[PDB]
């Protein structure tokens, strides 16, 4: 399905894998998803290249990360090109895509234009969609983040990184903790494997896009952003304290309305959120008029 590289062509197309800064002249965009993810240029192409940097749990995120790519076709999923498994690295390489992650543009990283609330919106059911493919073809993401929500030419979100992903068919515990602590679930902190996690994550996420914080933030009072919930359910605080300032046409009605679903992905007991199908309408509805 997916076209096999040798390790160096890829190599080659990235510089010999250079590992400056691209604004410095170099090939590295990034790391996350267990991987550094470089630059490359491939027939006139710029595409993505992630290095996966134990032994066996890194080729099996490797299989999982094909294994999804290969069940999972979709708009708001990154798309696989290709990979390479000769030598002693593990690539995957992937469309490109220009606008970088969520995160990043949230941020306005490197001085690009504060994202609108139209734009937010979109991208808010575009990564939901994404996530509710992921659920109906029975995966587990396990690393929901917007640094794992890239933005193609049109801002249209693509999640990214799967090599956590796992089958879903009762919840089962691993003995390996892994995540990201500001995004996770209180049941995916004590090991629990499920759905239900991914949407909690979710959540976060809609709270990155609403106040254009960042999930965690050692300077900040607070310094979980999931605790602005607590403080608005306590009347300390209302949602419009905390709207993203660097907005012109976000009105009440439908940023309450993503802060509602945001609100509901949050809710503390796993089995009192809704699925992604719910979140997935919730959203659509926020937009409908
Ligand atoms: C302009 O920048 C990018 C363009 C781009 N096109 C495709 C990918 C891609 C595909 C599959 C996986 C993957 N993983 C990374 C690691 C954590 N999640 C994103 N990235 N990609 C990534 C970046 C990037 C990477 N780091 N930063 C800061 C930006």
């Known amino acids: 399905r997916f076209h096999s590289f040798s390790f160096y062509e890829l190599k080659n197309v990235t510089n010999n894998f250079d590992e400056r800064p691209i604004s410095v002249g170099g090939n590295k965009m990034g790391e996350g998803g267990f991987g550094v993810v470089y630059k490359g240029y491939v027939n006139n192409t710029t595409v993505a290249v992630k290095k996966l940097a134990t032994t066996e749990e890194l080729k099996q995120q490797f299989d999982q990360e094909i294994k999804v790519m290969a069940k999972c076709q979709h708009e708001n999923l990154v798309e696989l090109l290709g990979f390479s498994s000769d030598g002693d690295d593990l690539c995957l390489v992937y469309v490109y895509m220009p606008n970088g992650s969520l995160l990043d543009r949230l941020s306005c990283l490197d001085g690009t234009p504060p994202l609108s ?6 991208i808010a059911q575009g990564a939901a969609n ?8 029975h995966h587990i993401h396990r690393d929901i983040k917007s640094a794992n929500i890239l933005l193609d030419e049109a801002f249209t979100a693509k999640i990214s990184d799967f090599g956590l992903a796992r089958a879903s068919e009762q919840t089962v515990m691993t003995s390996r903790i892994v995540g990201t602590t500001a995004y ?3 049941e995916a902190l004590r090991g629990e494997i499920t759905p239900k996690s991914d949407i909690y994550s979710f959540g976060v996420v809609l709270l990155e896009i609403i106040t254009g914080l960042p999930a965690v933030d050692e300077h900040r009072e607070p310094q979980l952003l999931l605790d602005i919930k607590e403080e608005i359910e306590d009347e300390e605080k209302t949602i419009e304290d905390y709207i993203d300032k660097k907005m012109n046409d976000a009105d009440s009605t439908s940023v309450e309305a993503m802060y509602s679903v945001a609100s509901q ?17 919730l959203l659509q509805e926020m937009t409908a008029s």
């Open 117 to 122: 609330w139209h734009m937010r919106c979109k």
């Open 130 to 137: 994404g996530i509710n493919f992921l659920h109906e073809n």
């Open 184 to 186: 996770m679930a209180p």
């Open 265 to 281: 992905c949050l809710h503390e007991k796993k089995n009192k959120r809704p699925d992604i199908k719910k979140v997935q309408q």
